[PDB]
Paper text:
Stalled ribosomes at the endoplasmic reticulum (ER) are covalently modified with the ubiquitin-like protein [name] on the 60S ribosomal subunit protein RPL26 (also known as uL24). In a pathway analogous to ubiquitin and other UBLs, post-translational attachment of [name] to the lysine residues of target proteins, UFMylation, is catalysed by an enzymatic cascade of E1 (UBA5), E2 (UFC1) and E3 ([name]) enzymes. Collectively, we identify a fundamental role for UREL in dissociating 60S subunits from the SEC61 translocon and the basis for UFMylation in regulating protein homeostasis at the ER.
UREL forms a clamp-like C-shaped architecture that wraps around the 60S subunit contacting the ‘A site’ at one end and a site close to the peptide exit channel at the other end. [name] forms the central part of the C-clamp, acting as a bridge that contacts both [name] and [name]. [name] anchors UREL onto the ribosome through a module that interacts with [name], which we have termed the [name]-binding domain (RBD). UREL binding to [name] buries a surface area of around 1,075 Å2, with binding predominately mediated by [name] WH4 and WH5, as well as [name]. Hydrophobic contacts between [name] WH4 residues Trp256, Phe260, Tyr266 and Leu275, [name] residues Val377, Leu378 and Val380, and [name] Phe189 are the main interactions at this interface. Comparing the unbound and ligase-bound 60S density maps within the same sample reveals that [name] undergoes a substantial positional shift after binding of [name] and [name], stabilizing the L1 stalk into a more closed conformation. We find [name] to be ‘sandwiched’ between the WH1′ domain and the long N-terminal helix of [name]. A ten-residue segment ([name](196–205)) connecting the WH1′ and N-terminal domains of [name] binds to [name]. UREL wraps around the ribosome in such a way that the catalytic module, located at the intersection of [name], [name] and [name], orients the C-terminal Gly83 of [name] towards the stretch of RPL26 that contains Lys134, the major site of UFMylation. Despite having set out to trap UREL in a state in which it is poised to transfer [name] from UFC1 onto RPL26, the [name]–UFIM–[name] interaction suggests that the 60S–UREL–UFC1–[name] cryo-EM structure represents the post-UFMylation state in which UFMylated RPL26 is stably bound by UREL.
Author numbering:
A (entry chain B): 27 to 237, 242 to 388, 476 to 734, 773 to 786
B (entry chain D): 120 to 304
C (entry chain C): 5 to 49, 64 to 79, 89 to 243, 339 to 502
D (entry chain A): 2 to 217
E (entry chain E): 2 to 77
The structure:
C-alpha cells in the first residue's frame, strides 16, 4: 500500500469516529491523545520534575491546544503535579529546591524569597507556600513570611542580636527606631524581642517612648539632674532653657516630675515657693507701713514683665479685705495710706496758693513728687501724678470753697442772712416802678413809643437785672460792690459759670434787653426771679397809689429845688402829664419837646407857651416852677 | 375717388389671388405627373424583379436537375451489418453492478485494465462507476495512484484503527508497513 | 492532407477503439500471447521486437518452432491490429501513470535531503551554543573547564593560606577598637563587670588558630563554621558600634552632650568623626575580605560535600547535553549523505524511461502514418 | 566635646598654676574666668541669670553668716560659724549705713524659715540692694553641709556690659580639679546664652596677680 | 481502402444501429441518402449528429468524417 491513500484511510476513520488521533506538525506521524500524556509524563520525569508546555510542543511535535488539554488532565491524574505560569512542577523538583535552599541557608545565614524567585523564575506566592509546607521537615530554619518572606537559621538570630547590642551600646541621644530598622536592615519583631531581653538583663539601659524613639538612661539622667539642680539652686525654671535641653513641652515635664512640690506657672516660667513668700512679705510690709514696694528687684532678672504681673496678681489675691491698695506700672504696689499722705502733703501748699488767688500742670506734680519722693522709676512718677490729678483737684476745689466761706462767713454770711431781705425789697421797688412806664409806653404814639421804650430798656431794666446778676455772682464772688458795675461782658462771664436750669431763664432775661418790647421782658424777668428765689410782689392798688404819690412828691421837690433849666422844664412837663393823666412817666432828654407838644391838649395856653419858649433855647423860668406849686 | 380706391384695391386683390391659384394648380398637376412617372418606374422594377424570379426558378430547377442526375453515380454501396439497441434496464443495471461487486470482492485487487475488460467498459467509464459507488459508499477501498483499486472491509478498517489506538505513535511509513501486514491482497 | 493527425495522449486508446481497428477483449488475447512468449523466451535465436526477431530467425533458423511461434503470434497481432492496441496501451499507461510516479519519488528524495540538511545545521548551531554556555558557567565558578571535581578540590585545597593573612590583619588594628567599645559599654551601659567581644580579644594577641586552644575540629579558628560565625558576628557588632558613633559625632556637641562625657575615662573623651571613620573603614575592609572569600564558595566546598556534588552534576549535565547533541547532528549528517547517495543511484531510471517512451512514441506515430498514408501524426 | 579642648584647658591651667615667669606671693591666689560676649544688646535682649555649684571650693575665705533663731544659734555656737540673733538685727534701726556694712562684711547669708519671712520688717530693703538675700535653712538639714554648699556656688548675671568674670579656684589645686571647675562653669554659661557659641567672643583664665591665658 | 459509418437512429425505441462500407473519398450525401432510405425517413429535416450531439457538415468526403468526429454516429 502507499502513503497518500493510507492518509486517506485515516481521515475516513476519523470521520467515522472509529479512531481519535492528532496530526504531527511535521505531518509524517500520528499520535493518539492517550500517548501525548505518556510523552508528557515521561519528559516531566526525565528533565527533573519541571517542564514547559512550549518545550512539550517542541518535543512531542503537536500543536499547543492538545498539550493544553492534557496538562489539565495530568494535574488530576497525578496529584503531585501543578501548573504555574504554564509549567508542570513536580514535588520531587520542589524537594530538590528545598535541599538547595537548605544548603544556601546554612551557608549565608539567610535567604530572600525575591532572590529565590529571580534565580528560579517561579512566582513568589508559589515558592512561599512550597517552602513553608516543608519548612522544618527538610529546611532547618524559621519563616518570616511578612518582610520579604526571608527565611533564616539559628545563626542569623545570633548575628541580629549581636548587631543590635552593638548599635544600641552607642546611642546616647533619643533616636528613632524606624530609621534604624530601615537603614541597617533589621526585623521589627526580632529587634524588639532582643531589645526587651537586653534591657531586662541590664546590658542596655533605656526605654522606648511611644510604644518610636529610644531614650537611653544616660540622657534622661543628665536631663533630670540638670533641671533638678537648677530648680534647687535658683528656685524657678524658664521654659526656654528647658527647650534647649530637649524638652519641648515644659509645662508637662515639670508637672510629671515636680508634683508633690508647690509651684506657680507663669507663661514662660515656673516660680517655686520661696519667691512668692518673699514677694508676699514685702507687700505685707508695704501694706502695714503705709508705704510702697517694687517687686521687680525681688525676682530673677530673666522674668518678663508679664510673668511678674501674673505673679503679683496671684500674691495680691491674699489681700481682699485689707487696704484697697493699687498697682502702678504692673509691679509697684502703693498702699492707700500713702496716697492719702501725698494728698495731704500737697494740701498745705494748695491752700496757701488758693488763699493767694482768692490745678497746676502734671509736670509740676511730678516735680513735687521728685522733690519729696526718692529712688523711684520714672513710670511710677508719671502714673502717680496721673492718678493724683483728679483727687488733688477735688481737694483744691474744696479748699477754695472753704477759704471763700471763711473769708465770707461774715460777708456772704450777711449776704445770705441779712442782705437778701434788702435785695427783695429793692427789686420790689424797681419792679413796681417799671409798671407805670409800661403804662407810659402804651399811651404815647408809635415813634414816641419807640423812643420811650428804648430809653426805659436802657435805663431801668438793666437797673434790675444787675441786681440779680450781682446776687448770682455772689456765689462765684467775682461780683462788684457796686450793682451799677455790671456790664454785658460781665453778664456773659457770669452766665459762663451758671447752672443750666437757671442759665436758660437768665438768658431769656438778658437777651430780652435786645428786644423791642417790654412785656416779654416782664415775663422773662419774673421767670428769672423765681428761677433764683426772688419773691416779686406786684404792689396792689394801695402800693400803686403810694408809688404814684411818692413820684409826684419827689418830682415837685426836685424841680422846686434843682437849678438845671432843661431838667426843670423836663420835670415840669412830665409832672403836668402825670397830674392830668394819673400815671407815671420816664422819658429821655431826647424827647422832652414831644410831651410838651402833646400836653397842650390838657393845660392852659399860657403855661404851654412858657414851656415851649423855655425849651426853644431867668425871670421867665422862675415862672415855670411856680406853675407846679400853683397847679 | 374713394369708391375708386376701393375698386382698385379689389382688382389688386384679384391679382393677389389668381396667381396663387394657378401656382397651386401647377404644383399639384406636375407633382402628380412625377409621382405617376415614379409609379411607372416601379412597374418597370416589378418587371425586372419578375425576370429575376423566373430566371431564379430556372436556376433552382437547374440545381434540381443537377442533383437528380447527381445521384446516379451513387448507389453502389454495401451494408456490412445491422444492429439494434436492446436493453439497459435498471433491473439489468442492478444485476450488472451486483456481478461487478461479487467479482471485485473475489478478486479484491484490480488494475482497471482487467477490470475494464471483464466489466467491459472503457476505463474512464469504470472509474466513474467506481468513484460514484465509493462516494455514496457501498464498498470502501483504496484507488492507487499508480493505477489500481483494492477493497477494504470494515473489519480490516477496525483492525487498522486498533493498530493506531494501540501502538501510540506511528509514522506514515510505519503505517504503510502495517498495512502491507494486515490488509490482505 | 497536411491537416496533422493530432490527439491528446491519454485518449489514444479511446480514439483507436472508436476507430474500430481494435476492440475490447484484446486483453485475454495478449495474456495468451504472453503465455506463448514464455516459450519464445525459453528458446531464443513485442510486435516491433517481433519484426527484429523475424529478421534474426530468418537467418539463425519452419522445421523449428523458434520462429513459427512468432509467425502465429504476429498473425494474431495483426488480427484486428491487436499489436496496435497493445502498444498503444503500453505507451499510454507508461506515460500517464509512471512518469508522475518516478518524478514524484525523486522530488520527495530531494525534499528529504533539504530537510535533513537544515536539521543538521540547526543541531550544530545548538551544540555550539551549549558549549559556549557551559564555558560561561565554569568561568562564573572560576574553573578552567577540565575535570570539574578535580578543579573544585584543588580550589578548596588552597584555602588555608589567605585566612592566615586575615588573622594577621586582625591581630593588629583592633587594639583601639576593642578598648573603646569596652570602655563605652562599661560607661554608657553601666555594665563594667563583663568582657565584650571575647573571640576578638583572643585574636588580638593570642593567635588565629588552634580551635583546641579556644576550647581549652582541629582546624584554624575560621575553618570551623560556628567559631567563624561568631567571629564575623563580633566584627559586625564592633563595626556597627563605630559607625553609629560616627553618625552621632557628626552633629555639633550641645550642653547635654558635654555634660555626659565629663566623668568619662580619657579614651572615650576627645574622639572625632575622622578617628571613628578610620576604624570603621578598617573593620569594613576586613569584613569585606571575609565575605568576599565566602562569596567564592571556598567554605562550602570544605564542608557539606553535597554542594560540590551538585555543582559537578550541573556542569557535567551541560557538557553531556552538548556532546549528545553533537552525536545526533553527526548521525543526521550520515543519514542525509546516505539518502542523497540513494537518490543519485535511483536518478538514472527517469531518463531511461523517458527515452524509451519517446522511442515508442515515434514508433506509434510512424505506424499510424504508415497505415494512414504516411500522414503527420503526434500526441499531446 | 566643646570648642575648648582638654589639651588647651590643661595647657592654660599648667601656665597659670606652675610655669616659668610666675611670681610667688604671700597670699593664696584665686584663679578667675573672664568672658567677653558678642551679638548681645542688653537694652533689648533677655538678661540671663543663674547659679551653679562647682565641685571644689573656689574661695576658701568665703564668709557665711547664719541669721538664725534660738535653736540654730545654739547649733551654730557648737561651730565657728558666725551668727546673729533676732535681737541683734532689731538693734539696728533699719539704718541704711549699718545694713550696708553688715552686707559688706559677709559674702553669703543663711536664715531660718521663722526669720526669712521677717527680713523686710526688721532689716528693710538693704540686703536685696546689695545682692545678698539669705537662703533658707531647715532644721532637717546639716549646717556644715549647707554652709559648704553655699561656699561652692558661682553666679552668672548680666547687668549692662558684655564683660563677665567669676572665680573658679585657687593656686593650691591639683590641676585636675581646676580643669573640672572651668569645664563646669563654661558649659553652664553657654547653656545660659540664646545662641550657644555665637554669643561668646573670648575666654581667659587668670590668677589674681598673674599673666592672662586665652582659651577661646 | 474502405470505411464504414456507425448509423444508429434515435427516434426508434429499439435503436437500430447500421453499418455499411464505402471508400473514404465519397461525399457524405451518399451516406445520408442511403441511411434515410434504409430508415425510411425524410432526409431534409435530417441533421446527422454523432453520439455527443454536434452537427457535422454533410458536403464532405468520408475520410474527413471518419477522422474528425469518429465512426460512432447517429441520426435524429
Amino acid at each position: 500500500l502507499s502513503e497518500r491513500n493510507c492518509i486517506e484511510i485515516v481521515n475516513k476513520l476519523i470521520a467515522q469516529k472509529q479512531l481519535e488521533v492528532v496530526h504531527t506538525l511535521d505531518g509524517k506521524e500520528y499520535i493518539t491523545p492517550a500517548q501525548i500524556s505518556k510523552e508528557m509524563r515521561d519528559e516531566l520525569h526525565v528533565r527533573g520534575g519541571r517542564v514547559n508546555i512550549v518545550d512539550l510542543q517542541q518535543v512531542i511535535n503537536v500543536d499547543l491546544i492538545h498539550i493544553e488539554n492534557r496538562i489539565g488532565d495530568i494535574i488530576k491524574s497525578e496529584k503531585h503535579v501543578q501548573l504555574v505560569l504554564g509549567q508542570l512542577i513536580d514535588e520531587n523538583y520542589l524537594d530538590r529546591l528545598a535541599e538547595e535552599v537548605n544548603d544556601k541557608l546554612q551557608e549565608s545565614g539567610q535567604v530572600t524569597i525575591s532572590e529565590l524567585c529571580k534565580t528560579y523564575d517561579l512566582p513568589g506566592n508559589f515558592l512561599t507556600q512550597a517552602l513553608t509546607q516543608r519548612l522544618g521537615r527538610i529546611i532547618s530554619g524559621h519563616i518570616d513570611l511578612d518582610n520579604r518572606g526571608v527565611i533564616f537559621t539559628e545563626a542569623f538570630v545570633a548575628r541580629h542580636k549581636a548587631r543590635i547590642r552593638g548599635l544600641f551600646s552607642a546611642i546616647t541621644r533619643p533616636t528613632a527606631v524606624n530609621s534604624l530598622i530601615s537603614k541597617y536592615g533589621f526585623q521589627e519583631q526580632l529587634l524588639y524581642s532582643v531589645l526587651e531581653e537586653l534591657v531586662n538583663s541590664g546590658r542596655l539601659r533605656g526605654t522606648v517612648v511611644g510604644g518610636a524613639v529610644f531614650v537611653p538612661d544616660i540622657y534622661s539622667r543628665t536631663q533630670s539632674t540638670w533641671v533638678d539642680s537648677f530648680f534647687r539652686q535658683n528656685g524657678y525654671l524658664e521654659f526656654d532653657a528647658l527647650s534647649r535641653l530637649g524638652i519641648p513641652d515644659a509645662v508637662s515635664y515639670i508637672k510629671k516630675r515636680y508634683k508633690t512640690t508647690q509651684l506657680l506657672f507663669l507663661k514662660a516660667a515656673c516660680v517655686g515657693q520661696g519667691l512668692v513668700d518673699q514677694v508676699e512679705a514685702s507687700v505685707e510690709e508695704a501694706i502695714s507701713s503705709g508705704t510702697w514696694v517694687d517687686i521687680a528687684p525681688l525676682l530673677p532678672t530673666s522674668l518678663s514683665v508679664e510673668d511678674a504681673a501674673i505673679l503679683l496678681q496671684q500674691v495680691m489675691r491674699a489681700f481682699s479685705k485689707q487696704a484697697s491698695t493699687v498697682v502702678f506700672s504692673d509691679t509697684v504696689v502703693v498702699s492707700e495710706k500713702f496716697i492719702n499722705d501725698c494728698t495731704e502733703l500737697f494740701r498745705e501748699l494748695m491752700h496757701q496758693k488758693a488763699e493767694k488767688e482768692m490745678f497746676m500742670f502734671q509736670d509740676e506734680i511730678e516735680d513735687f513728687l521728685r522733690k519729696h519722693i526718692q529712688d523711684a522709676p520714672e513710670e511710677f512718677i508719671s502714673e502717680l501724678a496721673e492718678y493724683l490729678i483728679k483727687p488733688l483737684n477735688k481737694t483744691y476745689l474744696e479748699v477754695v470753697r472753704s477759704v471763700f466761706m471763711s473769708s465770707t462767713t461774715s460777708a456772704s454770711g450777711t449776704g445770705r442772712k441779712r442782705t437778701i431781705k434788702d435785695l427783695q425789697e429793692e427789686v420790689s421797688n424797681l419792679y413796681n416802678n417799671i409798671r407805670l412806664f409800661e403804662k407810659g409806653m402804651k399811651f404815647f404814639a408809635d415813634d414816641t413809643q419807640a423812643a420811650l421804650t428804648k430809653h426805659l430798656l436802657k435805663s431801668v431794666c438793666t437797673d434790675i437785672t444787675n441786681l440779680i446778676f450781682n446776687f448770682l455772682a455772689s456765689d462765684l464772688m467775682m461780683a462788684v460792690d457796686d450793682p451799677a458795675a455790671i456790664t454785658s461782658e460781665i453778664r456773659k462771664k457770669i452766665l459762663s459759670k451758671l447752672s443750666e436750669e437757671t442759665k436758660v431763664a437768665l438768658t431769656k432775661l438778658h437777651n430780652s434787653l435786645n428786644e423791642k418790647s417790654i412785656e416779654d421782658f416782664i415775663s422773662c424777668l419774673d421767670s428769672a426771679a423765681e428761677a433764683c428765689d426772688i419773691m416779686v410782689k406786684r404792689g396792689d392798688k394801695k402800693r400803686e397809689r403810694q408809688i404814684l404819690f411818692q413820684h409826684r412828691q419827689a418830682l415837685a421837690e426836685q424841680l422846686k429845688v434843682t437849678e438845671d433849666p432843661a431838667l426843670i422844664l423836663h420835670l415840669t412837663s412830665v409832672l403836668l402829664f402825670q397830674f392830668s393823666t394819673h400815671s407815671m412817666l420816664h422819658a429821655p432828654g431826647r424827647c422832652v419837646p414831644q410831651i410838651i407838644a402833646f400836653l397842650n391838649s390838657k393845660i392852659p395856653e399860657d403855661q404851654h407857651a412858657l414851656l415851649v419858649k423855655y425849651q426853644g433855647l431867668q425871670e421867665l423860668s422862675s415862672s415855670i416852677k411856680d406853675l407846679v406849686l400853683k397847679s | 375717388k374713394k369708391l375708386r380706391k376701393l375698386e382698385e384695391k379689389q382688382a389688386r386683390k384679384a391679382q393677389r389671388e389668381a396667381e396663387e391659384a394657378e401656382r397651386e394648380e401647377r404644383k399639384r398637376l406636375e407633382s402628380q405627373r412625377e409621382a405617376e412617372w415614379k409609379k411607372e418606374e416601379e412597374r418597370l422594377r416589378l418587371e425586372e424583379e419578375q425576370k429575376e424570379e423566373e430566371e431564379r426558378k430556372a436556376r433552382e430547377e437547374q440545381a434540381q436537375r443537377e442533383h437528380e442526375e447527381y445521384l446516379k453515380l451513387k448507389e453502389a454501396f454495401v451494408v456490412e451489418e445491422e444492429g439494434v439497441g436492446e436493453t439497459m434496464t435498471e433491473e439489468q443495471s442492478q444485476s450488472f453492478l451486483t456481478e461487478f461487486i461479487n467479482y471485485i470482492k473475489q478478486s479484491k485487487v484490480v488494475l482497471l485494465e482487467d477490470l475494464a475488460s471483464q466489466v467491459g467498459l472503457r476505463t474512464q467509464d469504470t472509474i466513474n462507476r467506481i468513484q460514484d459507488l465509493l462516494a455514496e459508499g457501498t464498498i470502501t477501498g483504496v484507488i492507487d495512484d499508480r493505477g489500481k483499486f483494492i477493497y477494504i472491509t470494515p473489519e480490516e478498517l477496525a483492525a487498522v484503527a486498533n493498530f493506531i489506538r494501540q501502538r501510540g505513535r506511528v509514522s506514515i511509513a510505519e503505517l504503510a508497513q502495517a498495512s502491507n501486514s494486515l490488509i490482505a491482497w | 492532407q497536411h491537416v496533422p493527425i493530432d490527439i491528446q495522449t491519454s485518449k489514444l486508446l479511446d480514439w483507436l477503439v472508436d476507430r474500430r481497428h481494435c476492440s475490447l477483449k484484446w486483453q485475454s488475447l495478449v495474456l495468451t500471447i504472453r503465455e506463448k512468449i514464455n516459450a519464445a523466451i525459453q528458446d531464443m535465436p513485442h510486435y516491433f521486437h517481433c519484426l527484429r526477431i523475424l529478421d534474426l530467425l530468418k537467418g539463425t533458423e519452419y522445421s523449428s518452432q523458434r520462429m513459427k511461434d512468432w509467425q502465429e503470434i504476429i498473425a494474431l497481432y495483426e488480427k484486428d491490429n491487436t499489436y496496435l492496441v497493445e502498444l498503444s496501451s503500453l505507451l499510454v499507461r507508461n506515460v500517464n501513470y509512471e512518469i508522475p510516479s518516478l518524478k514524484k519519488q525523486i522530488a520527495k528524495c530531494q525534499q528529504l535531503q533539504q530537510e535533513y540538511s537544515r536539521k543538521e545545521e540547526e543541531c550544530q548551531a545548538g551544540a555550539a551554543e551549549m558549549r559556549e554556555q557551559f564555558y560561561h558557567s565554569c568561568k562564573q565558578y572560576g574553573i578552567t573547564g577540565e575535570n570539574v571535581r578535580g578543579e573544585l578540590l584543588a580550589l578548596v585545597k588552597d584555602l588555608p593560606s589567605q585566612l592566615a593573612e586575615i588573622g594577621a590583619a586582625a591581630q593588629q588594628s583592633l587594639g583601639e577598637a576593642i578598648d573603646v567599645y569596652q570602655a563605652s559599654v562599661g560607661f554608657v551601659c553601666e555594665s563594667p563587670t563583663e568582657q565584650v567581644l571575647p573571640m576578638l580579644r583572643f585574636v588580638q594577641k593570642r593567635g588565629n588558630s588552634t580551635v583546641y586552644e579556644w576550647r581549652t575540629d582541629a582546624l584554624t579558628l575560621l575553618e570551623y563554621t560556628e567559631t567563624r560565625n561568631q567571629f564575623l558576628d563580633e566584627l559586625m557588632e564592633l563595626e556597627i558600634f563605630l559607625a553609629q558613633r560616627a553618625v552621632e559625632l557628626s552633629e555639633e556637641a550641645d550642653v547635654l552632650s558635654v555634660s555626659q562625657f565629663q566623668l568619662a575615662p580619657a579614651i572615650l573623651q576627645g574622639q572625632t568623626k575622622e578617628k571613628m571613620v578610620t576604624m570603621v573603614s578598617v573593620l569594613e575592609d576586613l569584613i569585606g575580605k571575609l565575605t568576599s572569600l565566602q562569596l567564592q564558595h571556598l567554605f562550602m566546598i570544605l564542608a557539606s560535600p553535597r554542594y560540590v556534588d551538585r555543582v559537578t552534576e550541573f556542569l557535567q549535565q551541560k557538557l553531556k547535553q552538548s556532546q549528545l547533541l553533537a552525536l545526533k547532528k553527526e548521525l543526521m549528517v550520515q543519514k542525509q549523505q546516505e539518502a542523497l547517495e540513494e537518490q543519485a543511484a535511483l536518478e538514472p531510471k527517469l531518463d531511461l524511461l523517458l527515452e524509451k517512451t519517446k522511442e515508442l512514441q515515434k514508433l506509434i506515430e510512424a505506424d499510424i502514418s504508415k497505415r494512414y498514408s504516411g500522414r503527420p501524426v503526434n500526441l499531446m | 566635646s566643646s570648642k575648648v579642648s582638654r589639651d588647651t584647658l590643661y595647657e592654660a591651667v599648667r601656665e597659670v598654676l606652675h610655669g616659668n615667669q610666675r611670681k610667688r606671693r604671700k597670699f593664696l591666689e584665686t584663679v578667675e574666668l573672664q568672658i567677653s560676649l558678642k551679638n548681645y544688646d542688653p537694652q533689648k535682649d533677655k538678661r540671663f541669670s543663674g547659679t551653679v555649684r562647682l565641685k571644689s571650693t573656689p574661695r576658701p575665705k568665703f564668709s557665711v553668716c547664719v541669721l538664725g533663731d534660738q535653736q540654730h544659734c545654739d547649733e551654730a555656737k557648737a561651730v565657728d560659724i558666725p551668727h546673729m540673733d533676732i535681737e541683734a538685727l532689731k538693734k539696728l534701726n533699719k539704718n541704711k549705713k549699718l545694713v550696708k556694712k553688715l552686707a559688706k562684711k559677709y559674702d553669703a547669708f543663711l536664715a531660718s524659715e521663722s526669720l526669712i519671712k521677717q527680713i523686710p520688717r526688721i532689716l528693710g530693703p538693704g540686703l536685696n540692694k546689695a545682692g545678698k538675700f539669705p537662703s533658707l535653712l531647715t532644721h532637717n538639714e546639716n549646717m556644715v553641709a549647707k554652709v559648704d554648699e553655699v561656699k561652692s556656688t558661682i553666679k552668672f548675671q548680666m547687668k549692662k556690659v558684655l564683660c563677665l568674670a567669676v572665680a573658679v579656684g585657687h593656686v593650691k589645686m591639683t590641676d585636675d580639679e581646676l580643669v573640672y571647675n572651668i569645664h563646669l562653669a563654661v558649659n553652664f554659661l553657654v547653656s545660659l546664652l540664646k545662641k550657644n557659641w555665637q554669643n561668646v567672643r573670648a575666654l581667659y583664665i587668670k590668677s589674681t596677680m598673674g599673666k592672662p591665658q586665652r582659651l577661646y | 481502402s474502405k470505411v464504414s459509418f456507425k448509423i444508429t437512429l434515435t427516434s426508434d425505441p429499439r435503436l437500430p444501429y447500421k453499418v455499411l462500407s464505402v471508400p473514404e473519398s465519397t461525399p457524405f450525401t451518399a451516406v445520408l441518402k442511403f441511411a434515410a432510405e434504409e430508415f425510411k425517413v425524410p432526409a431534409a429535416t435530417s441533421a446527422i449528429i454523432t453520439n455527443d450531439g454536434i452537427g457535422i457538415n454533410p458536403a464532405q468526403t468520408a475520410g474527413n468524417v471518419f477522422l474528425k468526429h469518429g465512426s460512432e454516429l447517429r441520426i435524429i
